[PDB]
Assembly symmetry: D3
Homo-oligomer: 91 residues x 6
């Protein structure tokens, strides 16, 4: 297949000691400050019964979420030069 | 086509006044506190020349990102009962 | 730590009345037209028993999905100048 | 390393003719109806000059997006039994 | 509404035989090699009881994941000219 | 505001020494094997001129992508008990 042969070629060309486009790449995610898991939270509300049922816990967490009283913690590892939003701790 | 006919049927069944699985659905994202755009930031560093070039700005922002000195602002609108992480403002 | 000190500095520089890279930012998601939740749907098929079991409901919904008879509703809030796809209602 | 040895073992156990947890898996995405690319769109507005500059085109597309006049086309291939939203064509 | 009228206009302009920004668009995802589903895996460990409970299976899979002994299979269909990472099979 | 007061309360309850739902959380991403960046790749093809223009490089990479000759490297840090796909190195 035409498209296979191009790939196997390109492979070897990047693998060239000369060219070195292909390396191992470490990846770091900042350790996160004082934070919680949704499931643990909704679980906990039941153990304490300020929720009758689960969908009460989600609805509640959803409520909190959409008013910024909580904020989801993003799993993006990769700083982007785009119209993308970021924050310092210092607030 | 078999699979089309099932769909058109199912459609009408959810569209049943009785069943009402199909509605308009508002969506809310919390307004975000004091925050910045990657592009504006990397742009600004150049206007002020504490960056020689762009890839300096990204590399820098990346550095900040992966040590939690900045945190990306997530665009998820939807509170999840899963092993997913969340935070209050109060820190 | 070197990388901390740069951050705390940069912070104050963007916080400069002069510079104003750091603001509150409202976020809007279009209200969605007549649409449904996967869970509610698979749930409903059981209440009516045109599904023996759950994995029947998923498999079915999956079937529908991959033939465009249904389309997932995207949670992206942010119009992108990229090779990214978009649609008007008018179809 | 402890954790490596568990992996290599588990591997062979799923690879067991008996167990067969590990197969090739085809993946289908519905062909999309009449739709457009952001970049092509913003590009086109310039060719026709109803945009002075690019950030006008994005701002405009963003405007359209957040009022549902356009909707981003999702790349999810995988029907989910969750509080996740979906639509038929028939609208 | 001002913003509606712009949309309906723009629509018709792209719909122009002349302009043709708006087409059907096929989408392809590579068939995946020998691979497994999380749920099936954690399920299987129980059937065989090398897991006492579920959260043991997740914790284990998580362990494997974060040491590269397994790698999640990405659902991105769209090759990006960005600081984004890719691999050949030939390893 | 009603919904604020619930949040500030819930906060303190999870912050209870007793309850401890709220901790720092380390995050690990496996170091990736021999791999490449899209931008570097498309860049390189130009330096060597087996591409006339950029959109040739993307189109090519896209071609490779959708036939599994290359595979995008996922940034998910979080093993999921779902119908989600995974792979060992051992292939």
């Amino acid at each position: 297949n035409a498209i296979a042969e191009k790939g196997e070629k390109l492979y070897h060309m990047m693998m060239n000691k000369k060219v070195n486009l292909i390396k191992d790449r470490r990846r770091k995610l900042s350790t996160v400050p004082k934070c919680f898991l949704g499931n643990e939270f909704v679980a906990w509300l039941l153990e304490i019964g300020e929720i009758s049922k689960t969908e009460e816990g989600v609805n509640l967490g959803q409520a909190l979420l959409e008013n910024g009283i909580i904020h989801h913690v993003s799993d993006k590892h990769q700083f982007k030069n785009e119209q993308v939003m970021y924050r310092f701790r210092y607030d």
